[PDB]
Each structure stands twice: as C-alpha cells, then as structure tokens.
Coordinates of C-alpha atoms in Angstrom, one line a residue:
Chain D
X1 CA 14.7 -11.9 -35.7
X2 CA 14.7 -11.1 -31.5
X3 CA 14.6 -8.4 -30.5
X4 CA 16.9 -5.3 -31.3
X5 CA 18.9 -5.0 -27.1
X6 CA 18.8 -8.4 -25.2
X7 CA 21.8 -9.5 -26.3
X8 CA 22.1 -13.3 -25.6
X9 CA 19.0 -15.4 -23.1
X10 CA 19.7 -18.3 -21.2
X11 CA 17.2 -21.2 -20.0
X12 CA 16.5 -23.1 -17.2
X13 CA 13.7 -24.9 -14.7
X14 CA 14.3 -24.4 -11.6
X15 CA 14.8 -26.1 -8.2
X16 CA 13.8 -24.2 -5.7
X17 CA 10.3 -22.7 -3.7
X18 CA 11.3 -19.4 -5.2
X19 CA 10.5 -19.5 -8.9
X20 CA 8.3 -22.5 -9.2
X21 CA 5.1 -22.5 -10.2
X22 CA 2.3 -22.8 -7.1
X23 CA -1.1 -23.8 -7.4
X24 CA -3.9 -24.5 -5.0
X25 CA -5.1 -28.1 -5.4
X26 CA -8.8 -28.7 -5.9
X27 CA -8.1 -30.1 -2.0
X28 CA -7.0 -26.9 -1.1
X29 CA -3.5 -28.1 -1.7
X30 CA -0.4 -25.7 -1.7
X31 CA 2.2 -27.5 -4.6
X32 CA 4.6 -26.7 -6.3
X33 CA 5.5 -26.9 -10.3
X34 CA 8.8 -26.7 -12.0
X35 CA 8.3 -23.9 -14.6
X36 CA 11.1 -23.6 -17.6
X37 CA 11.9 -19.4 -17.2
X38 CA 14.4 -17.9 -18.9
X39 CA 16.6 -15.0 -18.9
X40 CA 18.2 -12.7 -20.8
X41 CA 21.2 -9.9 -20.4
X42 CA 19.5 -6.2 -21.3
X43 CA 16.1 -5.3 -21.2
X44 CA 13.3 -3.4 -23.9
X45 CA 10.7 -4.9 -22.0
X46 CA 8.0 -3.3 -23.7
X47 CA 8.3 -5.4 -26.5
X48 CA 8.7 -8.6 -24.4
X49 CA 5.9 -8.7 -22.7
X50 CA 3.5 -8.3 -26.2
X51 CA 5.2 -11.2 -27.9
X52 CA 2.4 -14.6 -27.7
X53 CA 3.1 -17.3 -25.1
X54 CA 4.9 -14.8 -22.7
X55 CA 3.2 -14.2 -19.5
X56 CA 2.4 -10.3 -19.2
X57 CA 2.1 -11.1 -15.6
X58 CA 4.9 -12.2 -13.2
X59 CA 7.8 -11.1 -15.9
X60 CA 9.7 -8.3 -14.3
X61 CA 12.9 -6.1 -15.1
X62 CA 15.8 -5.6 -12.8
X63 CA 15.9 -2.0 -13.5
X64 CA 13.5 0.4 -11.8
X65 CA 13.5 2.8 -13.9
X66 CA 11.6 1.0 -17.5
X67 CA 9.4 -0.2 -15.0
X68 CA 8.9 3.6 -13.7
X69 CA 8.3 4.3 -17.6
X70 CA 5.9 1.4 -18.6
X71 CA 4.4 -0.2 -15.6
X72 CA 3.5 3.5 -13.6
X73 CA 4.7 4.4 -9.2
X74 CA 3.2 2.1 -7.6
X75 CA 4.9 -0.9 -9.2
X76 CA 8.7 1.0 -9.0
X77 CA 7.1 1.3 -5.2
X78 CA 7.0 -2.4 -5.2
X79 CA 9.3 -3.5 -7.1
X80 CA 12.7 -1.4 -5.1
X81 CA 10.9 -1.9 -1.1
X82 CA 11.4 -6.2 -3.2
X83 CA 14.8 -6.0 -4.4
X84 CA 16.0 -3.7 -0.5
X85 CA 14.2 -7.5 0.4
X86 CA 16.5 -9.8 -2.1
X87 CA 19.5 -8.5 -1.2
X88 CA 19.1 -7.9 2.1
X89 CA 18.0 -12.4 2.5
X90 CA 20.9 -12.9 1.2
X91 CA 22.8 -13.9 3.7
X92 CA 20.4 -15.3 6.2
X93 CA 20.1 -12.0 8.1
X94 CA 17.5 -10.0 8.3
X95 CA 15.4 -7.2 9.0
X96 CA 11.9 -5.6 10.0
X97 CA 9.9 -4.8 7.3
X98 CA 8.6 -1.4 8.8
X99 CA 12.0 0.5 7.9
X100 CA 11.9 -0.6 4.1
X101 CA 8.5 0.3 3.7
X102 CA 8.6 3.8 5.0
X103 CA 12.1 3.9 3.2
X104 CA 11.0 2.8 0.1
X105 CA 6.8 5.2 0.9
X106 CA 9.3 8.4 1.5
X107 CA 11.3 7.7 -1.6
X108 CA 9.1 8.0 -3.3
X109 CA 7.0 10.7 -2.2
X110 CA 6.4 13.4 -4.8
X111 CA 5.8 11.9 -7.8
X112 CA 8.9 11.5 -9.2
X113 CA 11.7 9.5 -8.7
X114 CA 13.9 11.9 -6.6
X115 CA 17.2 10.0 -6.0
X116 CA 18.7 10.2 -2.7
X117 CA 21.4 11.9 -4.1
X118 CA 23.2 15.5 -4.0
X119 CA 21.0 17.3 -6.9
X120 CA 17.9 14.7 -5.7
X121 CA 17.8 16.4 -1.7
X122 CA 18.9 19.7 -3.8
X123 CA 15.1 20.1 -4.4
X124 CA 12.6 20.1 -2.2
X125 CA 9.8 22.7 -0.7
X126 CA 13.1 23.0 1.8
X127 CA 13.5 26.5 4.1
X128 CA 16.9 28.5 3.3
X129 CA 19.1 27.5 6.1
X130 CA 19.2 24.0 5.3
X131 CA 20.7 23.9 1.6
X132 CA 22.9 27.0 2.7
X133 CA 24.5 23.3 5.3
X134 CA 24.9 21.7 1.9
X135 CA 28.2 22.9 -0.3
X136 CA 26.5 26.0 -1.6
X137 CA 25.6 28.9 1.2
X138 CA 26.4 32.0 -0.2
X139 CA 24.4 31.7 -3.6
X140 CA 20.8 30.1 -2.4
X141 CA 21.3 32.8 0.0
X142 CA 22.2 35.6 -2.5
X143 CA 18.4 34.8 -4.0
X144 CA 17.2 34.3 -0.5
Chain L
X1 CA -10.0 -15.5 6.5
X2 CA -9.3 -18.8 5.9
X3 CA -10.6 -17.8 1.6
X4 CA -9.3 -14.3 2.2
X5 CA -5.6 -15.3 3.9
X6 CA -4.5 -17.8 0.5
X7 CA -4.6 -14.5 -1.5
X8 CA -2.9 -12.3 0.6
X9 CA -0.2 -15.0 1.0
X10 CA 0.4 -16.5 -2.4
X11 CA 3.2 -18.2 -2.0
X12 CA 1.9 -20.2 1.2
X13 CA 4.3 -19.0 3.6
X14 CA 3.0 -19.1 7.2
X15 CA 5.2 -17.0 9.5
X16 CA 4.7 -14.4 10.6
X17 CA 5.3 -11.6 12.6
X18 CA 2.7 -9.6 14.8
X19 CA 1.4 -8.9 18.4
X20 CA 1.1 -10.2 22.5
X21 CA 1.7 -14.2 21.7
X22 CA -0.6 -16.7 21.8
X23 CA 0.2 -20.0 22.6
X24 CA 2.8 -19.0 25.0
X25 CA -0.4 -16.5 26.8
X26 CA -2.3 -20.7 26.7
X27 CA 0.7 -22.1 28.4
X28 CA 0.4 -20.1 30.9
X29 CA -3.4 -19.4 31.8
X30 CA -2.2 -23.3 32.2
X31 CA 0.0 -23.5 35.2
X32 CA -1.4 -20.6 36.9
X33 CA -4.8 -21.8 37.5
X34 CA -3.3 -26.1 37.9
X35 CA -5.9 -26.6 34.5
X36 CA -5.6 -30.9 34.9
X37 CA -5.8 -31.8 31.1
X38 CA -7.7 -35.1 32.2
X39 CA -11.0 -34.2 32.9
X40 CA -14.2 -32.4 31.2
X41 CA -14.0 -28.3 32.2
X42 CA -16.5 -26.4 33.0
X43 CA -15.6 -23.3 29.7
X44 CA -19.7 -23.4 27.6
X45 CA -18.6 -22.8 23.9
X46 CA -20.9 -19.9 23.4
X47 CA -19.5 -18.0 26.9
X48 CA -15.5 -18.4 23.8
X49 CA -18.0 -17.2 21.2
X50 CA -19.1 -14.2 22.9
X51 CA -15.8 -13.9 24.3
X52 CA -13.7 -14.0 21.7
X53 CA -16.4 -10.8 20.2
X54 CA -16.2 -8.8 23.0
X55 CA -12.5 -8.2 22.7
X56 CA -12.2 -7.8 19.4
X57 CA -14.1 -4.7 19.8
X58 CA -12.3 -3.2 22.2
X59 CA -8.7 -2.9 19.6
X60 CA -8.5 0.2 18.3
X61 CA -6.4 1.4 16.5
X62 CA -8.3 4.1 14.7
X63 CA -11.1 5.6 16.8
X64 CA -13.4 7.2 14.7
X65 CA -17.5 6.3 14.6
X66 CA -18.3 7.7 10.7
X67 CA -16.8 5.9 8.0
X68 CA -14.2 6.1 6.1
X69 CA -13.0 5.7 9.4
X70 CA -14.6 2.7 10.7
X71 CA -13.1 0.2 7.8
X72 CA -9.6 1.8 8.3
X73 CA -9.8 0.2 11.7
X74 CA -10.7 -2.7 10.1
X75 CA -8.0 -2.7 7.2
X76 CA -5.5 -2.4 10.1
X77 CA -6.5 -5.3 12.8
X78 CA -7.1 -7.2 10.3
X79 CA -4.7 -10.0 9.8
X80 CA -4.6 -9.8 14.0
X81 CA -8.1 -10.7 14.3
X82 CA -8.5 -13.2 12.2
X83 CA -4.9 -15.6 14.0
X84 CA -7.2 -14.7 17.1
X85 CA -10.9 -15.8 16.3
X86 CA -8.5 -19.1 14.5
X87 CA -6.6 -20.2 17.8
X88 CA -9.1 -19.1 20.5
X89 CA -12.0 -21.2 18.1
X90 CA -14.6 -23.2 20.5
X91 CA -13.1 -26.5 18.7
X92 CA -9.2 -26.2 20.0
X93 CA -10.1 -24.8 23.4
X94 CA -12.8 -27.8 24.0
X95 CA -10.2 -30.6 23.1
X96 CA -6.8 -29.4 23.7
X97 CA -6.2 -26.8 25.4
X98 CA -9.3 -27.4 27.5
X99 CA -9.3 -24.2 30.0
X100 CA -10.9 -23.7 32.3
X101 CA -14.2 -20.9 33.2
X102 CA -11.7 -18.7 36.0
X103 CA -8.8 -19.2 33.5
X104 CA -10.6 -17.3 30.3
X105 CA -11.4 -14.5 32.1
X106 CA -7.0 -14.2 32.7
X107 CA -6.5 -14.8 29.1
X108 CA -9.3 -13.0 27.3
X109 CA -7.7 -9.5 30.1
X110 CA -4.4 -10.4 29.5
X111 CA -4.5 -9.6 25.6
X112 CA -6.7 -6.4 25.9
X113 CA -3.2 -4.6 28.1
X114 CA 0.0 -6.9 26.6
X115 CA -1.6 -5.5 22.9
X116 CA -2.2 -2.1 24.0
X117 CA 1.5 -1.2 25.2
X118 CA 2.4 -2.7 21.5
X119 CA 1.0 0.9 19.3
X120 CA 3.9 3.4 19.3
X121 CA 4.0 6.7 21.3
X122 CA 3.9 10.1 19.6
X123 CA 7.4 11.3 19.2
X124 CA 9.6 9.2 18.0
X125 CA 12.1 10.0 15.4
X126 CA 11.6 6.8 13.6
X127 CA 12.5 8.8 10.8
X128 CA 16.9 8.7 11.2
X129 CA 15.5 5.4 13.3
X130 CA 15.1 3.6 9.5
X131 CA 18.7 5.1 8.6
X132 CA 20.7 3.1 10.1
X133 CA 19.2 0.2 10.9
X134 CA 19.2 -0.4 7.2
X135 CA 23.3 1.5 6.6
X136 CA 24.4 -1.8 9.0
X137 CA 23.5 -4.1 7.0
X138 CA 24.8 -2.7 4.0
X139 CA 28.1 -3.5 5.9
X140 CA 27.7 -6.5 6.1
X141 CA 26.9 -7.2 2.0
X142 CA 29.6 -9.0 0.0
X143 CA 31.5 -5.9 -1.9
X144 CA 31.3 -7.7 -4.9
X145 CA 29.8 -11.2 -4.4
Chain Y
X1 CA 2.4 -10.3 -43.1
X2 CA -2.0 -10.3 -41.8
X3 CA -1.7 -13.1 -38.8
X4 CA 0.4 -11.1 -37.1
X5 CA -1.7 -8.4 -37.8
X6 CA -5.0 -10.0 -37.3
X7 CA -4.1 -11.0 -33.4
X8 CA -3.1 -7.7 -33.0
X9 CA -6.4 -6.6 -34.2
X10 CA -8.5 -8.2 -32.1
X11 CA -5.6 -7.6 -28.4
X12 CA -5.8 -4.2 -28.9
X13 CA -9.5 -4.7 -28.8
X14 CA -10.0 -6.6 -26.4
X15 CA -7.7 -4.6 -24.2
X16 CA -10.1 -0.8 -24.5
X17 CA -13.3 -3.1 -24.1
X18 CA -11.8 -3.3 -20.5
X19 CA -10.2 0.2 -19.9
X20 CA -13.4 1.7 -21.5
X21 CA -16.0 -0.4 -18.9
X22 CA -13.1 0.2 -15.9
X23 CA -13.7 4.0 -16.7
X24 CA -17.6 3.2 -15.8
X25 CA -19.1 2.7 -19.5
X26 CA -21.5 0.7 -20.2
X27 CA -20.4 -2.9 -22.0
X28 CA -21.7 -5.7 -22.6
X29 CA -20.9 -9.3 -21.1
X30 CA -19.3 -11.5 -24.3
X31 CA -17.5 -8.0 -25.7
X32 CA -15.2 -8.5 -23.1
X33 CA -14.0 -13.0 -24.1
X34 CA -14.9 -12.3 -27.9
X35 CA -12.2 -14.9 -29.0
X36 CA -10.3 -14.8 -32.4
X37 CA -11.9 -16.7 -34.4
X38 CA -15.1 -15.2 -32.9
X39 CA -13.2 -11.8 -34.4
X40 CA -11.9 -13.9 -37.3
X41 CA -15.4 -14.1 -38.6
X42 CA -16.9 -11.2 -37.4
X43 CA -14.7 -7.7 -38.5
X44 CA -12.9 -9.8 -42.3
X45 CA -10.3 -12.7 -41.5
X46 CA -7.3 -10.0 -42.6
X47 CA -6.9 -7.3 -42.8
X48 CA -4.3 -7.4 -45.3
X49 CA -6.7 -6.6 -48.5
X50 CA -9.7 -7.0 -46.1
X51 CA -12.2 -5.5 -44.9
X52 CA -11.2 -4.9 -41.9
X53 CA -9.1 -1.6 -42.9
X54 CA -9.1 0.0 -39.4
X55 CA -12.3 2.0 -39.5
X56 CA -15.2 -0.7 -39.2
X57 CA -13.3 -1.0 -35.5
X58 CA -14.3 2.2 -34.2
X59 CA -16.0 1.7 -30.6
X60 CA -18.7 4.0 -29.5
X61 CA -19.9 3.7 -25.7
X62 CA -22.1 4.6 -23.3
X63 CA -22.3 5.4 -19.6
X64 CA -23.4 4.2 -16.9
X65 CA -25.7 6.9 -14.0
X66 CA -26.0 8.0 -18.4
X67 CA -27.2 7.9 -20.7
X68 CA -25.9 11.9 -22.4
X69 CA -22.1 11.5 -22.5
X70 CA -20.4 8.9 -24.8
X71 CA -16.8 8.2 -25.7
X72 CA -15.9 7.6 -29.1
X73 CA -12.4 5.7 -30.4
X74 CA -10.4 5.9 -33.2
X75 CA -8.0 4.4 -35.2
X76 CA -5.7 6.3 -37.8
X77 CA -4.9 5.2 -41.0
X78 CA -1.5 6.5 -41.7
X79 CA 1.3 5.3 -39.3
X80 CA 1.9 9.0 -38.0
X81 CA -1.0 12.0 -37.5
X82 CA -1.3 15.1 -39.3
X83 CA -3.0 18.8 -38.4
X84 CA -6.4 18.1 -40.1
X85 CA -6.7 14.0 -40.3
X86 CA -8.0 14.4 -36.0
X87 CA -9.6 17.3 -37.3
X88 CA -11.9 15.9 -39.7
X89 CA -12.2 13.9 -36.4
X90 CA -13.0 16.6 -34.4
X91 CA -16.1 17.7 -36.7
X92 CA -17.4 13.6 -36.7
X93 CA -17.3 15.2 -33.1
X94 CA -18.5 17.8 -34.1
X95 CA -21.8 16.4 -36.0
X96 CA -22.1 13.9 -33.0
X97 CA -22.2 15.6 -29.7
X98 CA -19.0 14.2 -28.0
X99 CA -16.7 15.1 -26.4
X100 CA -15.3 12.5 -24.5
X101 CA -12.6 10.6 -27.5
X102 CA -9.6 8.1 -27.5
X103 CA -7.0 8.0 -30.3
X104 CA -5.7 5.0 -30.6
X105 CA -2.1 6.0 -32.5
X106 CA -0.4 3.5 -34.7
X107 CA 3.2 4.1 -34.4
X108 CA 3.7 7.9 -34.0
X109 CA 2.3 12.1 -33.6
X110 CA 3.2 15.2 -34.8
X111 CA 5.1 18.0 -32.7
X112 CA 2.4 20.2 -34.4
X113 CA -0.6 17.7 -34.1
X114 CA 0.9 17.6 -30.5
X115 CA -0.4 21.5 -29.9
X116 CA -3.2 21.0 -32.7
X117 CA -4.6 19.5 -28.6
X118 CA -3.9 20.9 -26.1
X119 CA -5.5 24.3 -27.6
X120 CA -10.0 23.1 -27.2
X121 CA -9.3 22.8 -23.3
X122 CA -13.3 23.5 -23.0
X123 CA -14.8 21.8 -25.2
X124 CA -13.3 17.8 -27.1
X125 CA -11.1 16.5 -24.9
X126 CA -9.4 13.7 -26.8
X127 CA -6.7 11.3 -25.7
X128 CA -3.6 10.2 -27.5
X129 CA -2.4 6.7 -27.4
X130 CA -0.3 4.4 -29.0
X131 CA -0.2 1.3 -30.6
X132 CA 1.9 -1.1 -28.6
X133 CA 0.7 0.1 -24.7
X134 CA -2.6 -0.8 -25.4
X135 CA -1.4 -4.4 -26.0
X136 CA -1.5 -5.9 -22.6
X137 CA -2.9 -5.1 -19.1
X138 CA -0.8 -3.4 -16.6
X139 CA -3.7 -3.6 -14.5
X140 CA -3.6 -7.2 -14.2
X141 CA -0.2 -6.8 -13.6
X142 CA 2.0 -8.7 -10.2
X143 CA 3.1 -5.0 -8.8
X144 CA 0.3 -3.0 -10.0
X145 CA -2.4 -2.7 -7.0
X146 CA -6.2 -2.5 -7.1
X147 CA -6.7 2.3 -7.9
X148 CA -9.6 3.2 -7.0
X149 CA -10.8 7.0 -8.1
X150 CA -12.6 8.7 -5.7
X151 CA -15.9 10.9 -6.0
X152 CA -15.2 15.2 -4.9
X153 CA -18.2 14.2 -2.5
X154 CA -15.5 11.4 -0.8
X155 CA -12.5 14.1 -1.6
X156 CA -14.2 16.8 1.2
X157 CA -14.5 13.3 4.5
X158 CA -10.5 12.3 3.5
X159 CA -9.6 15.8 4.8
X160 CA -12.1 16.5 7.3
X161 CA -11.5 12.7 8.8
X162 CA -7.8 12.8 9.4
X163 CA -8.5 16.7 9.3
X164 CA -5.7 17.5 7.1
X165 CA -5.4 19.9 4.6
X166 CA -4.6 18.6 0.5
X167 CA -1.7 19.8 -0.2
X168 CA -0.4 17.6 3.1
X169 CA -1.6 13.6 0.9
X170 CA 1.3 11.9 -1.1
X171 CA 1.6 13.0 -4.9
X172 CA 1.0 11.7 -8.6
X173 CA 1.9 13.4 -11.6
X174 CA -1.1 12.5 -15.0
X175 CA 1.3 11.1 -16.4
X176 CA 2.4 7.6 -15.2
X177 CA 0.7 4.2 -17.1
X178 CA -2.5 4.0 -14.4
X179 CA -2.6 7.7 -14.7
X180 CA -4.0 7.8 -17.8
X181 CA -5.5 4.2 -18.1
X182 CA -8.0 5.9 -15.5
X183 CA -8.3 9.3 -17.5
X184 CA -7.2 11.3 -14.6
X185 CA -7.2 15.2 -14.6
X186 CA -5.6 17.5 -12.1
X187 CA -7.2 18.0 -8.4
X188 CA -8.6 14.3 -8.4
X189 CA -7.1 12.5 -5.4
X190 CA -6.5 8.2 -6.3
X191 CA -7.4 5.8 -3.3
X192 CA -4.9 2.5 -3.7
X193 CA -5.8 -1.5 -1.9
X194 CA -2.9 -3.1 -1.3
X195 CA -2.5 -5.8 1.0
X196 CA 0.7 -5.9 3.0
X197 CA 1.8 -8.6 5.7
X198 CA 1.9 -7.7 8.5
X199 CA -2.0 -5.5 8.8
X200 CA -3.0 -8.0 6.0
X201 CA -4.7 -5.1 4.7
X202 CA -3.8 -1.5 4.0
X203 CA -5.5 2.1 1.8
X204 CA -3.6 4.3 1.1
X205 CA -3.7 8.1 -1.4
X206 CA -3.3 9.9 -3.0
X207 CA -3.0 13.5 -4.8
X208 CA -3.2 13.8 -9.3
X209 CA -0.7 17.0 -9.3
Chain I
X1 CA -14.5 17.1 25.2
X2 CA -13.5 15.8 22.3
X3 CA -9.5 14.6 23.3
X4 CA -8.3 12.1 20.7
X5 CA -5.0 11.3 22.1
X6 CA -3.8 8.1 24.0
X7 CA -4.5 8.1 27.5
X8 CA -1.0 6.8 28.0
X9 CA 2.0 8.3 29.4
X10 CA 4.6 8.3 26.8
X11 CA 7.5 7.2 27.7
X12 CA 9.2 10.9 26.6
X13 CA 7.5 12.8 28.9
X14 CA 7.9 10.3 32.1
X15 CA 11.4 11.2 31.8
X16 CA 11.1 15.1 31.1
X17 CA 8.4 15.2 34.4
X18 CA 10.6 13.6 36.2
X19 CA 14.3 15.8 35.4
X20 CA 11.5 18.5 35.5
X21 CA 10.7 17.8 39.1
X22 CA 13.4 17.3 40.9
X23 CA 15.1 20.3 39.3
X24 CA 12.1 22.2 41.4
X25 CA 12.8 20.1 44.7
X26 CA 16.7 20.6 44.4
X27 CA 15.2 24.3 44.6
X28 CA 13.1 24.2 48.1
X29 CA 9.3 23.8 46.7
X30 CA 7.4 21.9 48.9
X31 CA 6.8 18.0 48.3
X32 CA 3.7 16.8 48.2
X33 CA 3.9 13.0 49.8
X34 CA 5.8 11.7 53.3
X35 CA 8.6 11.2 52.7
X36 CA 11.0 8.9 55.0
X37 CA 15.4 9.7 55.7
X38 CA 15.1 10.7 51.9
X39 CA 17.5 12.8 49.8
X40 CA 18.3 12.5 46.9
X41 CA 15.9 15.1 44.9
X42 CA 15.6 12.7 42.1
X43 CA 14.8 10.0 44.3
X44 CA 11.7 12.0 46.4
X45 CA 11.0 13.2 42.4
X46 CA 10.6 9.0 41.6
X47 CA 7.7 8.5 44.2
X48 CA 5.9 11.6 43.2
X49 CA 5.2 9.8 40.6
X50 CA 4.4 6.4 42.0
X51 CA 1.0 8.2 44.5
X52 CA -0.8 10.0 41.4
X53 CA 1.0 13.6 43.2
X54 CA 2.6 15.5 41.0
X55 CA 1.7 18.9 39.9
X56 CA 1.9 19.2 36.5
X57 CA 0.0 19.6 33.1
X58 CA 0.8 18.5 30.1
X59 CA 0.4 20.2 26.8
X60 CA -0.2 18.3 23.8
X61 CA 0.2 19.4 20.5
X62 CA -1.6 17.8 17.5
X63 CA -0.9 18.5 13.7
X64 CA -3.1 21.2 13.1
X65 CA -1.5 23.5 15.7
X66 CA -4.8 22.9 18.4
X67 CA -3.8 21.3 21.9
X68 CA -4.7 19.6 25.0
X69 CA -4.4 19.5 28.1
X70 CA -3.9 16.6 30.4
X71 CA -3.4 15.8 34.0
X72 CA -0.4 14.9 35.3
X73 CA -3.2 12.4 37.0
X74 CA -5.5 11.2 34.7
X75 CA -2.4 9.6 32.6
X76 CA -2.1 5.5 33.2
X77 CA 1.8 5.1 34.1
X78 CA 3.2 3.4 31.4
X79 CA 5.6 1.5 33.8
Chain G
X1 CA 20.7 13.1 5.8
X2 CA 17.5 12.1 3.8
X3 CA 15.4 11.4 5.9
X4 CA 17.3 13.0 9.4
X5 CA 13.2 14.8 10.1
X6 CA 10.2 12.1 10.1
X7 CA 8.2 11.3 12.5
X8 CA 4.6 10.6 14.6
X9 CA 2.2 12.5 15.0
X10 CA -0.1 13.0 17.6
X11 CA -2.6 11.4 15.7
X12 CA -0.8 8.3 14.4
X13 CA -0.2 10.3 11.2
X14 CA 4.2 9.8 9.9
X15 CA 4.3 12.9 9.2
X16 CA 7.0 14.8 6.5
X17 CA 8.7 18.2 7.9
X18 CA 6.0 20.1 5.7
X19 CA 3.0 18.2 7.9
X20 CA 3.4 15.9 4.7
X21 CA 2.0 13.0 5.3
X22 CA 4.5 9.8 4.7
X23 CA 1.5 6.3 6.3
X24 CA -1.6 6.9 7.6
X25 CA -0.1 4.9 9.9
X26 CA 3.0 3.7 11.7
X27 CA 4.0 0.8 9.4
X28 CA 0.9 0.8 8.5
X29 CA -0.5 -1.4 11.5
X30 CA 0.7 1.1 14.1
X31 CA 2.6 -0.8 16.4
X32 CA 6.6 -0.3 17.7
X33 CA 8.9 -2.9 16.1
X34 CA 10.4 -3.9 19.6
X35 CA 6.7 -5.5 20.8
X36 CA 6.1 -8.6 18.3
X37 CA 7.2 -11.5 17.7
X38 CA 7.1 -15.1 14.6
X39 CA 4.4 -17.0 14.8
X40 CA 2.0 -19.8 12.0
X41 CA -1.8 -19.1 10.8
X42 CA -2.6 -22.7 11.1
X43 CA -5.8 -21.6 9.3
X44 CA -4.1 -21.2 4.8
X45 CA -1.8 -24.1 5.0
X46 CA -4.3 -27.4 5.8
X47 CA -6.4 -29.3 3.1
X48 CA -10.3 -29.1 2.8

C-alpha cells in the first residue's frame, strides 16, 4: 500500500491557531476548529494530492524545487516567503516585510530558481569587470 | 470594505503596519483645543464625509490620469483608505471622540502632511539595506534546534 | 478495478471543463458541476469492458467571441503514444478544420513523437498533457494567485505609461504549470493580482520568455 | 512641463547642496545673506538654505534617459 | 554580494543594474520602512 517514498506518517490535532480550521459563522464571527492533520517523512506530492478525501488546496511540502516542478513559479515565491517568515519569527523576533518581499522577488526574477551561490551569480547579463572580481578573472577576460 | 478585509486577512488578526497613527492624532487634537467630552459638539456630519473624501483624493502614490495608472493608485492605497474610512466615520466621531469644527481641519491638514513624508526617497540603495537586515537576524538563529 | 477508473475519468473531465472555460471558451453551466453519479449514468457505469472506452469522452468547444475557432481534446488509448497515432488525430483535425487541439496522454509518449509535434509550427498546434497532472486544479490552490492574460492592445499601454521596453519586465518561462494551463506563447504578458498586507492589493506583470 | 518627480528636496540632495555651496564660500565666493558675526563656511551655507537663496540647479536623471531641472528655490525643504 | 546594486529610481520603480524592473513600487506600497507603526483595523473582527 501507499506511496513508495513516504516512510512514516504521524497524526495529531493541534491546539494553536496556526494549523486550526478558522471559519466565519452566520453572525460573521471568526471561530477556530481543531482538525486532524497528517505529517510525513518523505515527499512525492503530485500523487498525494491526487488521492481521495485529501484536501488538494491546503496541502503543501517544505521542499521548494518540488513546488517549482509541480505548482509553478509564483508558488515558489510565496512558499519561500512563508518559510523565511517562519524561520525568522521562531524565537519571537520580528523583521519588516519589505525586506522579505524584495529578497524573495530578486531571487526568482529571471524565471527559474537561481541560488545565491557561486554558479548562480556566475549567470546573468552582467559586465566583464564584475566576473573578474570573482576567481576567474583571466579566462573570462580573455573570452571578452 | 468589511467584506474585502475578510478575504485579504483570512485568519482573522488585526495587527497591521501602516503610516501615521490615527488614534494618537485624535488624542492630540482633543487637547490642543480643550475638547470637553461632556457638551454637544458643532461638527456637521456631511462635513466629515466630504472632508474625508477630499483628503483621500490628495494621497497620490501613482500620479496619472489614464486607466492602468488610475487603478494602480487605487491598488496602492487600498488598506490605508479602508482604515481611514473606518476610523473617521460620522457615528464614531460624534459619539466617542466628539471633536469640534476647528479641531477637525487641523487633523485633516496633519494626516496629509505626515503621510507625504513617508514616501520612499528616490536614490536609497534599497538592495544592500535589505541584505544586512536579514543577515543579522540570521545571527540570532539557533544553531541546531 | 473500475470504481477507481470511473472516478478518475469523471475527475479529469471536470478539470478540463474548467481549463477550457478559463481560456475563454463557451462551456454550458451544468457541465461544470457534473456530479459523479450523473457522469456514471450518462457515459456508462464502468470503462472496464464498458461503454466509456476513453473515446466517447472527447470534447469539442467553440470560442465565445468567434464561433469558428474551435478546440478539440483527445484521450489516447495506448499507455504510450506512437507516431501515426497522432497523425490519426492530425488527419482528424485535417478533415474537420480545427487547429486548436489537446491530447490527454495516459502515461507517456515517445521521443520520436516528441519530434512529430514540434514540426507543424504554423498550423495544427497541439498541447501534450499527462493523465496525472489534470487530476487536480492547481489554479484553486492556496499559494497560486490569480493570473489574467492581457490583449496585445493593453500591453502597449504599459510600456507607454511606465515608459518601459519589453525586456525590462520580470520573466516567466513557458514550461511551468500555469504557463501551460493558460496556453501561453512567447511574447505574451500575463497579469498577476495578489493581496498583500502593507497595501491591500498589488498588481505585477510577467513576460513569458 | 511634465514634471513627474517629487517636489520635496530629498535627503541626499540636501547633503550635497550644503557641501558644494560651503566649498564655494571658502574660495571667496560672494554670499547672498546678511550674516552677523558668522565665520564658519558651513554655518553660513546652512542659513542660506533656510532663506531659499542658494544659486544651484539640480538635474534629476530619469532611468529612461530624460531629465528635468529644479531650482533649489522651488523645492520644499525636507527639514 | 548578490543584491548590491538594486535601488529606487526617480520614477518610484525598483530597478536592477541593467534596468530590469523588479517591483513596480517599493515594497508594493511606496513607503519607507522607517515611518510606519502598528495599528488595528477594528472592522473585521466584530460580529454582524
């Protein structure tokens, strides 16, 4: 039974208002409801979404290349923003929103996921005298 | 606007970050003019309505006249206008705040002047400012949780 | 089994009846909310040795603005599709005078077939899908904002209002799930409308290249 | 006309106008206010700004290649 | 080292070094993150 890669799946119902089901009543009041959620160890989301009696809207995964292949590019933007917010606000700290938005916008601007790394910066429409300040001066400048 | 807020904020919280404070600006105007919250006021309500309209007109973020430049302006200052209309309504400012006529033009003139100096300045290196604003809270991050 | 198989064919059908409704085609109202037992009674109880053969499921739709341009969708029978099998369809389009066509591939296709569809560029444009991907509408997910495609008269209003070129916009490659859901070609501009917590609403644009 | 930029003297243009005008005074340029016992070439250049009497024009460069010229008299001093 | 040359140009658009638009308005609102503070809506929470 089951999907090949997901190995262990837990079960619990939360008490926080983070994973609860918040509904608007007929009197327009916000009411929170405890609902069972499931968490796995292993990811193959395209199949888990296709199964029955599994919410296809709110189900997500904490790996973003998977969401990139499965959901798109804007979903990567929003998921990356959400994970940055969750790791920042873990110890009660706080950082303004404009910085998260600008970072997760310049990080997914050219269409695909380019990491802020050595060979992620190596590729853009940049000049020759900037790639000479990074460890491959002579060869790229000979090309130029 | 009440129905639009319920879809912008689905969870239901109310703590948002915005320009110039409004409750403190009402509290100030209640004391620069010795407002006595015990007697009837002289603030005609259709004055409140039209004053808030005229003030909302002079808050331009995207200055233009043609469409696609007249709807992006309404998208930019969408939340602040909702907040301003819900706080300065005719019922509340005749029931709780009880501002006078003289003390309302001051408040209107100050909202605009403390908004126009919150706009960003053309030339600040926003990129580098957002790169060290996230890196130093990476220092507070726990090593292995 | 067939209960799993009569369920999927109803689900995949309901998805496509929205996908073509998004692209601006005319789909009757009750076709959108066709419940399961109604589907089971119309097309057949089971496709295992049944009346639903994965043919008798095909759909032909006409555009709203113009009754001439039409779109077809095919459901191949074999797991992986060969060469003349699409030319069987290419002939079926050749006879009925329809250029917009889709094929709901069952499990896969051949590299030779991959060659056989990129050739007819100026005519008979076909879109290749997968059976698995159409099982869920990704557009109604939580993270995915609302996209809208702009006519070529509106795009020339941006670049003249913000005094831009078309190279200076944010880019999106025509290979991600929402670029194909809307059937987008290179050189088009799509408009995203998302709500934010500082302003309330923010409209951004993407160039598909 | 068609001036699309802000009528407020930004934070950076106020720091460069005060620096340049102060250096011109140190090299014997004629002042444009009635100072009273003032000697610091940067204290004088600050009270000329308070009186809107600095003879300098700012050329703002838009990112499409155009520009427009604002007289320091015409701008609303931020501070 | 990644994001060094992003800045706000004189028409309120946040552009890259090669003038590639990144945001049509800074922070989607147009305001500096220096003169803002917390408030309450007081319209979404109460009942009908």
